[PDB]
Amino acid sequence: IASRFFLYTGPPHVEVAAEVIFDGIPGFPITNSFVVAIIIDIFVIALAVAATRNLQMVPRGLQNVMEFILESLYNLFRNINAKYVATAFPLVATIFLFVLFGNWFGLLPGVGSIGVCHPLSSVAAAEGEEIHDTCAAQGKKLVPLFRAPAADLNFTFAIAVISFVFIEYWGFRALGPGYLKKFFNTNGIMSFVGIIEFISELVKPFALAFRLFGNIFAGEVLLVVMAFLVPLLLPLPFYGFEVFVGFIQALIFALLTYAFLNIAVT
Amino acid sequence: GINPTLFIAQLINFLLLIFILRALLYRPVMNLLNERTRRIEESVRDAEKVREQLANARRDYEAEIARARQEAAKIVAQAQERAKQQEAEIIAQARREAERLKEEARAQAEQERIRMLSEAKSQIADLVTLTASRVLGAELQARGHDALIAESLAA
């Protein structure tokens, strides 16, 4: 069972960085995150149109799976607030469906392996291999073409700020001028808690963005460094944990935006 | 990395995604609402159709009891009509026939009795026999004559 942990074929080191700009020879250069965002857009649109193209009673196959996921998410949101479950559903649904596939893309062979570049070779008596990467030529860093979209602080900040503006739009939609009444109302001790609530309301999008970005970053980097430790037979349970945590985090992000909507509107 | 241009590009990409998926999530909402309305209205109309089927059964028993009652009424009506008919028959023919039989019978009685009103049928032979012999005598002896005895015999 534990007889074939051969580390002789493995990565030389670990490459850890923030989002990396793709080559992008023409103007407006895309990133490594803004090619996988496009590929996940295409994938989710293909799945939606495959479920859409044949709609009928007693669903079976992928259409049944999509309907089950949608109704499960509907029931999850209806528990929090049944008034807006049919109204704000598209945003939370696409947040969940997008971050789900963004996190599940990170496990794919090639994420951190393919590069655009804008045994004997391994070090002995060491647990980590030292086989140089392909583009060791010209001293290039082997820029990872595929990097998980949610592991970037730009797309994540984007969805966080759209969540912020959605919560504020649809809390201001039907509350009158009650937001100014909710914060610093100068009513006994409630002014202090209103000020702190305003600060918390300001820091919700930053908290969400940092949380999800760091979660995917930590997952992918853990995968990288523990493949660097032992290339095989070590990271199966941790790969399972990382795919599970990516899925559940994609869920919790949508639930957090919906719960913030509920607490803002009530 | 911190860059506003890439952030704005991601914002625009997600706006396109939310519009496309707004269409593709507007489709299943009244897919499922249509399914649920079909189910609930179908259960309601199934109960309704059960009730109307029971209404046919209720009208079935109503027609059954009504038809049984008019059948019973008409059979007893015919029974008593012909009953009165045959009582009229039995008493009428009984009385008239009995009266006819007794009146012809007494007429025959008078016809049998008229024939004895004649001299030989008036039984004169046994009269003279008992007067002559059954008086402990031979003939018209002792207290015996001929003329007045025959006159009283004629009576």
Partner: protein, 72 residues
């Protein structure tokens, strides 16, 4: 010696993690126990529950902000 800014950043984010982590844990445990005890008030509970988190997590975020003011 080396730069103390790195140690300062690390200490700030770490302690901001140790405090509000237990705070949010206790808040959610109490809320879920109250939900299991009586679901009828459930909606009201989560309202207050989130307010508690909206305070407690905020403190941690403050620490993180200090990190991004020192590391940067």
């Amino acid at each position: 010696m080396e730069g103390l800014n790195l140690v300062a950043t690390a200490l700030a984010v770490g302690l901001g993690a140790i405090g509000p982590g237990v705070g949010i844990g206790i808040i959610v445990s109490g809320a879920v126990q109250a939900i299991g005890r009586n679901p009828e008030i459930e909606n009201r509970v989560v309202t207050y529950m989130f307010i508690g988190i909206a305070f407690t997590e905020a403190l941690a975020i403050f620490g993180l902000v200090i990190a991004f003011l020192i590391g940067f």
